[PDB]
Amino acid sequence: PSFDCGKPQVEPKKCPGRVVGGCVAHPHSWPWQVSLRTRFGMHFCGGTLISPEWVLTAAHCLEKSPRPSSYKVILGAHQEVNLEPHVQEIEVSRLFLEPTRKDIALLKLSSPAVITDKVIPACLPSPNYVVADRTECFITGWGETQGTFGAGLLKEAQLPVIENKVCNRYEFLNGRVQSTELCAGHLAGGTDSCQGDAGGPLVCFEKDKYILQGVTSWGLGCARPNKPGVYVRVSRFVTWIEGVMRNN
Amino acid sequence: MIAGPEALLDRPSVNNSQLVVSVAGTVEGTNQDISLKFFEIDLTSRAMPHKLEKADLLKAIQEQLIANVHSNDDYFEVIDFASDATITDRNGKVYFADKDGSVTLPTQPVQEFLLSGHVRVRPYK
């Protein structure tokens, strides 16, 4: 227990649900947050640190280059552009695209990551697990870029999960959600939920820690008011994940 | 009955650049929208300077907020801009604040900018 996954060393603000615009998060209250950047250095997608050498993200983010040398990672950050001194910049060595759906990808760090109180992995869930309807979760990221104040600061929003059965009703996603994905948001009195980046994390607290339940989808991850967002349902891929880390 | 402004591109031209302030408020807790009749702020520098100060804008907004309280409305205390807040030119280009929360707007050309989005607020007491 000298820094276990899912346990932040800075209690998260835990922005209430439906708060317009979301909230700027407490710095380092989401130590698994990753910032996927290009060689030149520009931030462009999110990631979740799952172990000292592995970052989970969205395949779509890798569309431009297959060369893992074209990607860098930023760990422990809060500011999007101007970076702090403690920030950890690790280059990527290999890329692992999930075979069955090609939606998420695994990033292996050229060198491990010094686990500190600002850089702690998130906990993966149990294989094939299904987060119950209404469970309160959080999305975090630098996804929103239209605000004039606070531009660049890591933000968070609270989203309760929507049972796919409901999520797929005509009024909502109308049958577009596979069992391999989950939904989160509000169906009433809700607001924009676009703070997370594509590939960004969607974690849900359980008993005493934060478990990574979904990866913010490319495009459909950013939902408008009263429309739920769509995340890749991580539990449906833990096995594959565990295996990749275990063999590389 | 509150009628919002027109899009910058539709408004009549001016000869003294100004900031159109059309924001709504969000009651912390209930998250309900509070409509405020839009107002204007004059600019002169780079009249409020062309280098605006967050705390200033919020102060203008707070003043306007209590100037429109009708018999049935209650008083609200401006808390801060929601991450929602955005200042744009007539084309939709966004201007960003610095670390000290200061936004700096072009001196020339002369034009108007728009400040929209929400302002977090709580009922005064």
Swiss-Prot record, chain A:
Residues recorded with modification Phosphoserine: 35, 126
Cysteine pairs bridged by disulfides in the record: 5-123, 15-23, 45-61, 137-204, 167-183, 194-222
Residue span, Peptidase S1 domain: 19-246
Site (Cleavage): 18-19
Catalytic residues (UniProt): 60, 103, 198
Protein name as annotated: Plasmin light chain B
Boundaries of the shown chain within the full protein: 563 to 810 of 810
Swiss-Prot record, chain B:
GO cellular component terms listed in the entry, alphabetical order: extracellular region
Keyword annotations of the record: Plasminogen activation, Signal, Virulence
Organism from which the protein derives: Streptococcus dysgalactiae subsp. equisimilis (Streptococcus equisimilis)
Function: This protein is not a protease, but it activates plasminogen by complexing with it. As a potential virulence factor, it is thought to prevent the formation of effective fibrin barriers around the site of infection, thereby contributing to the invasiveness of the cells.
Keyword presence, Signal: yes
Descriptive protein name: Streptokinase C
From-to range in the entire protein, with total length: 27 to 173 of 440
Record keyword Signal present: yes
Highest taxon of source: Bacteria
